Design a protein around this ligand. Structure first.
Ligand SMILES: Cc1cc2nc3c(=O)[nH]c(=O)nc-3n(C[C@H](O)[C@H](O)[C@H](O)COP(=O)(O)OP(=O)(O)OC[C@H]3O[C@@H](n4cnc5c(N)ncnc54)[C@H](O)[C@@H]3O)c2cc1C
Ligand SMILES: NC(=O)c1ccc[n+]([C@@H]2O[C@H](COP(=O)([O-])OP(=O)(O)OC[C@H]3O[C@@H](n4cnc5c(N)ncnc54)[C@H](OP(=O)(O)O)[C@@H]3O)[C@@H](O)[C@H]2O)c1
Ligand SMILES: CCCCCCCS[C@@H]1O[C@H](CO)[C@@H](O)[C@H](O)[C@H]1O
Length: 260
């Protein structure tokens, strides 16, 4: 007996006791755009498919798929998914959707990535999307978590990109990674909303206050984070709007609920 739409696991890398990433074989049928998400899952006691929405953390051009996942004890899926091993499989619906796609935007000089927690996942994909560096001139990556260890997955991803011999210094003065913690001490602190309103992120990167003038950003955090951020965006003059139609910015829930 086989598992419908089952992909094999090629690697697992634990980052903290609540965060882990892993890569799987790509369904020979999958065709997507960096930033979209799909459904993945495992089987429970009776053999029931527990499905959950997951951003594809790897760029569209990758032959393998990568996922960055939260680990919730009691979580039906993650309490299970966190134990996945190389060779083991998972279910993966090859139906890619999501509003976090570059097409949903259109302008040019800036493409901001504003995320918190695992909401970095889609940007781990987009930050490695060639289109982001062609249809746009500068990519800002704002990631805010509670502690430094939660920044690790995205910080090592960013370090590798820049330190890479060729692709590095190619994302030279294109990508600007602005990580922040809100609990642990870290050279750059403060929440994304606050640092945008107060303008710190501007006099920090030595740039021009995010104006609705052909700018652009994608938001991915909790619901409270999305509304807060959206408000702050318009506070400058940006307007929502998704998949296939000119707009100022897009958002997506990094998860449903209040978060752990
Ligand atoms: C558009 C979309 C994209 C998503 N992409 C990802 C992804 O990239 N990686 C990922 O781990 N999850 C992602 N999520 C959340 C995911 O779908 C599941 O909720 C997650 O896999 C946990 O499932 P669970 O069954 O173990 O616990 P759940 O029963 O689903 O939730 C239990 C509680 O844990 C909290 N929680 C769940 N997920 C998170 C999280 N990611 N960060 C902080 N708290 C959380 C919430 O409080 C939730 O109510 C996404 C959700 C949506 C709606
Ligand atoms: N004092 C307490 O006893 C206490 C406090 C918090 C949580 N808890 C337990 O922790 C649980 C969940 O809390 P948590 O640890 O996940 O904290 P959290 O508020 O969910 O933190 C997640 C991240 O998102 C940021 N954030 C939250 N709202 C935001 C907004 N509207 N705009 C921009 N950024 C925003 C946070 O910044 P900030 O860090 O600045 O908030 C933090 O970096 C609660 O259910 C509770 O049971 C207890
Ligand atoms: C048309 C724009 C092309 C710009 C290049 C996009 C990344 S391409 C990517 O690069 C990796 C480098 O480590 C290789 O390992 C991998 O096989 C290759 O597909």
């Amino acid at each position: 007996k086989v598992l419908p739409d089952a992909q094999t696991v090629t690697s697992v890398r634990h980052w903290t006791d609540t965060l882990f990433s892993f890569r799987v074989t790509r369904p020979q049928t999958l065709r997507f755009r960096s930033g979209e998400f799909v459904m993945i899952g495992l089987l429970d006691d009776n053999g029931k498919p527990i499905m959950r929405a997951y951003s594809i953390a790897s760029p569209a051009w990758d032959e393998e798929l990568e996922f960055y996942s939260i680990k919730v004890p009691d979580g039906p899926l993650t309490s299970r998914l966190q134990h996945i091993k190389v060779g083991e499989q998972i279910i993966l619906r090859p139906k890619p959707v999501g509003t976090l796609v570059i097409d949903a935007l259109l302008p040019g000089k800036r493409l901001w990535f504003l995320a918190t927690g695992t909401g970095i996942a889609p940007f781990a994909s987009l930050m490695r999307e060639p289109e982001a560096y062609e249809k746009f001139d500068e990519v800002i990556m704002m990631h805010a978590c509670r502690t430094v260890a939660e920044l690790e997955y995205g910080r090592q991803l960013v370090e590798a990109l820049q330190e890479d011999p060729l692709i590095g210094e190619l994302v030279e003065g294109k990508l600007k990674y602005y990580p922040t913690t809100t609990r642990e001490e870290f050279h750059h602190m403060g929440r994304i909303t606050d640092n945008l309103a107060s303008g710190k992120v501007f006099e920090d990167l030595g740039i021009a206050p995010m104006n609705p003038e052909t700018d652009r950003a994608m938001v991915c955090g909790s619901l409270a984070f999305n509304v807060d951020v959206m408000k702050v965006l318009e506070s400058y003059g940006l307007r929502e709007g998704a998949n296939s139609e000119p707009r100022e910015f897009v958002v997506e829930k990094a998860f449903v609920g209040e978060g752990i």
